[PDB]
């Protein structure tokens, strides 16, 4: 469906004006919805965790990957809704948020690379898909070429991703030099304990992981997320992370690594501490994503990590989308538009939002306390399942570091809420412009999921026990 979509949209966008790109995005959003509705019955193939090898033995299809694909479709639906539906029908919001002509095509190609990463079973497919993701996401960072910051980020991202791709290719070709193979199915107990193979494998893991900001290589991606447009940041900060971490979780590559443990501790400490003096919103959220990436690095050392990873990545995706959507909604009440691309930059521009929109601040509070991991919300159950796994597998110092990072991160998560529930002079009394219906419904649905998804945890576990065990 994605390739059909790509081959259709290329023609239909070539033969269409720039006045039609928003409606094109709406069309393909409804297309993705219909796909996720009608074709999602394929979950029955994976009953009792039946796994399939496709295209020779180049792709792998199981419940894990089907779930990640449904999740990526859901994310693309939300991100396309943010481009296909105007928040307000004003000249300002037709200057700030306009889709460029090729943006949807590049999004769909990046989604294709994401899914061919998670579905990969041979390293040639992995490399082709990594490059199809990274080239497309370079161009996504660069499509708003009237921004100095975005062009600069485009080029930094090109070079750093290029170097890390060199690392991935070196790892792959060294694995081939040793074993004469490109497939991880070629490994077993005997081959692991007979060959020393951890340098190659951890080189691959780090080449994949530094592409999502794992410390000490975080500053460049945080600068890229800061310097890009908000509606591009929301995509480029989430989907690569899902793709690469899902590949590294499905591939059991770092089961008791000391290096990955060390770097995960470092990611937690950096992502918690460095976000304390950040005055800007996107850098704060970038460090939040960094510490969540650390929490998800921890479950690359387990060998039974599907439930924890899927729960945490789903809840982090919902929270990430919700918080970026709240920052997008808050632009109507900020008193100073900073740029055409990042209309809101600093956290103190959210001062007094409760007096203009109180339920938007209720949403912000729900998301902030899910990030902190406060029950009965969803992030609490995420953290609980992660802790369950890592303590069942014997990581006792990492657990205390995890608690300390959970505590230190709460400060910069609460910075937002604190300034939002402060008092402000020159409040809003009336406004005849109303925000969109669709985007309001999407945000409300995400917030309601965060708030009331714990009701279904029993049912989710019972389904997992049939499709993943």
């Amino acid at each position: 469906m994605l390739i059909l979509a790509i081959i259709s949209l290329i023609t239909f966008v070539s033969m269409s004006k720039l006045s039609d790109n928003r409606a094109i995005i709406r069309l393909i959003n409804i297309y993705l919805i219909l796909v996720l509705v009608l074709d999602s019955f394929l979950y029955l193939l994976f009953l009792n965790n039946q796994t399939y090898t496709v295209m020779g033995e180049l792709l792998i299809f199981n419940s894990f990957t089907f779930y990640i694909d449904m999740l990526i479709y859901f994310i693309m639906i939300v991100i396309s809704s943010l481009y296909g539906y105007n928040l307000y029908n004003n000249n300002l919001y037709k200057t700030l948020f306009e889709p460029k002509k090729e943006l949807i095509i590049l999004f769909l190609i990046n989604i294709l690379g994401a899914l061919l990463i998670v579905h990969s079973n041979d390293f040639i497919t992995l490399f082709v898909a990594i490059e199809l993701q990274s080239y497309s996401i370079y161009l996504i960072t660069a499509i708003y070429n009237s921004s100095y910051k975005a062009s600069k980020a485009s080029m930094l991202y090109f070079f750093m991703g290029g170097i890390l791709s060199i690392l991935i290719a070196y790892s792959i070709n060294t694995y081939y030099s040793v074993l004469n193979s490109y497939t991880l199915h070629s490994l077993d107990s005997l081959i692991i304990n007979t060959l020393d193979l951890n340098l190659i494998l951890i080189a691959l893991s780090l080449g994949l992981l530094f592409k999502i900001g794992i410390a000490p290589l975080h500053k460049w991606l945080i600068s890229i997320y800061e310097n890009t447009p908000i509606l591009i940041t929301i995509y480029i900060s989430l989907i690569p992370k899902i793709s690469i971490l899902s590949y590294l979780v499905l591939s059991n590559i770092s089961i008791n690594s000391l290096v990955i443990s060390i770097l995960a501790i470092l990611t937690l400490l950096v992502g918690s501490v460095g976000g304390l003096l950040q005055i800007k919103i996107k850098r704060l959220l970038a460090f939040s994503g960094l510490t969540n990436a650390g929490y998800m690095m921890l479950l690359l050392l387990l060998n039974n990590n599907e439930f924890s990873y899927l729960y945490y990545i789903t809840q982090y995706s919902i929270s990430h989308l919700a918080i970026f959507m709240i920052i997008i909604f808050s632009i109507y009440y900020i008193n100073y538009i900073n740029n055409q691309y990042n209309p809101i930059i600093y956290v103190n521009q959210l001062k007094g939002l409760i007096h203009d929109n109180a339920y938007l601040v209720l949403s912000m509070a729900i998301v902030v306390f899910s990030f902190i991991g406060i029950p009965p919300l969803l992030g609490f159950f995420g953290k609980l399942n992660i802790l369950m796994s890592i303590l069942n597998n014997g990581y006792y110092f990492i657990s205390i570091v995890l608690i300390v990072a959970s505590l230190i991160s709460a400060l910069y998560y609460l910075y937002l809420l604190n300034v939002s529930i402060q008092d402000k002079n020159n409040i809003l009394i009336n406004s005849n412009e109303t925000v969109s219906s669709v985007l309001s419904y999407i945000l409300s649905s995400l917030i309601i999921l965060i708030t009331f998804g714990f009701i279904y945890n029993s049912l989710i576990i019972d389904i997992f026990n049939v499709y993943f065990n």
Partner: protein, 49 residues
């Protein structure tokens, strides 16, 4: 009563049109605390004209 404070109680700048000026370029603060935009409509009014 208002002076902007941060997450850790530290001083934060109130960002205006005040310091998108040519004065506050060519200073070497870190990427986090710079406050010069380089994409502001104040600076980029004559760009590729």
């Amino acid at each position: 009563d208002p002076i902007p404070s941060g997450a850790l109680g530290q001083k934060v700048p109130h960002v205006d049109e005040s310091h998108q000026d040519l004065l506050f370029r060519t200073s070497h603060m870190v990427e986090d605390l710079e406050t010069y935009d380089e994409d502001s409509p104040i600076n980029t009014s004559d760009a590729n004209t």
